[PDB]
A paper describes a structure:
[name] contains an Aspartate-less Receiver (ALR) REC-like domain, which retains the common (α/β) fold of canonical REC versions, yet lacks “invariant” residues in its catalytic pocket required for typical phosphotransfer, including the phospho-accepting Asp residue crucial for the histidine kinase-[name] phosphorelay.. Here we show that [name] regulates pneumococcal iron homeostasis in response to cellular peroxide concentrations through its single Cys (Cys128) located within the linker domain of the protein.
The X-ray crystal structure of the full-length reduced state mimic RitRC128S was determined to 1.7 Å resolution with selenomethionine (Se-Met) Single Wavelength Anomalous Diffraction (SAD) method. Thus, to eliminate any heterogeneity caused by this phenomenon, we mutated the redox-active cysteine residue (Cys128) to serine, which would be unable to oxidize and activate the protein. The resulting RitRC128S exhibited no evidence of dimerization in solution using both SEC and 2-dimensional nuclear magnetic resonance (NMR) techniques. These molecules are nearly identical with root mean square deviations of 0.69 Å for all Cα atoms, are independent, and do not form a dimer with each other, nor with any symmetry-related molecule. However, more positive charges are visibly present in PhoB, as [name] contains several aromatic amino acids in these same positions, which are also (notably) able to hydrogen bond with DNA. Finally, we observe that the trans-activation loop (colored magenta in Fig 3), responsible for the binding and direct recruitment of RNA polymerase, would be inaccessible to RNAP in the RitRC128S structure. Combined with the fact that [name] requires oxidation to bind and repress Piu transcription, from these studies we can be fairly confident that the RitRC128S structure is reflective of the inactive, reduced state. The most unique and striking feature of the RitRC128S structure is the α5 helix linker, which connects the REC and DBD sections of the protein.
Residue numbers in the entry: 2 to 230
The structure:
Amino acid sequence: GKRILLLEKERNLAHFLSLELQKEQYRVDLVEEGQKALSMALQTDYDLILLNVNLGDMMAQDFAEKLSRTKPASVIMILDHWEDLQEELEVVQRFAVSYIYKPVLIENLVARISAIFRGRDFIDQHSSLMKVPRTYRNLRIDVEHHTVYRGEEMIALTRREYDLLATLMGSKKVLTREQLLESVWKYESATETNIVDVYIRYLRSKLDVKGQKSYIKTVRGVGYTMQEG
């Protein structure tokens, strides 16, 4: 089964989530602080890393940035109280594939994790069919390693940003926000179209060079497409 790295500060909840996730045949490694979580995530490829906003010895944002130096498309999901998540909402959107509020309902957590895994699988399969060369202007995508480069620099795209780029680069046509939702949030049927604009903004911030045309064009009345220089 897929492998989950789990850090939950509430002891009884951590134990509960560990046991319930193993009933889905997932392999669950429970850790209690970020330093240990980080050493484990650096040496093992986890399919999901499930964290609180604050890991105790560091913020989850800090963990994610440090992990991203070698594994930029890591799949991190944040579980926390509403007030804790909202205090850090913008930074959480930037590094996490999803977030979920306490008090958690296990059937909901299980369904969401399943959908996230299936959506990543879809992206992988679809991107394997991308026309070669997988380049655009100064960008190149390494589909095997889920990495992106602009010139000779690695661009630390998050998993959502990577999935969004692969979807845009793999399309010959302008894509609507509904079509982008259907590809990048596939199987996460509760996702709504305004999230697409958020991640287009994030993706532009990572790709774009000041004084060049953006890598992504907004097409009036339609949606988004890659943009030439």
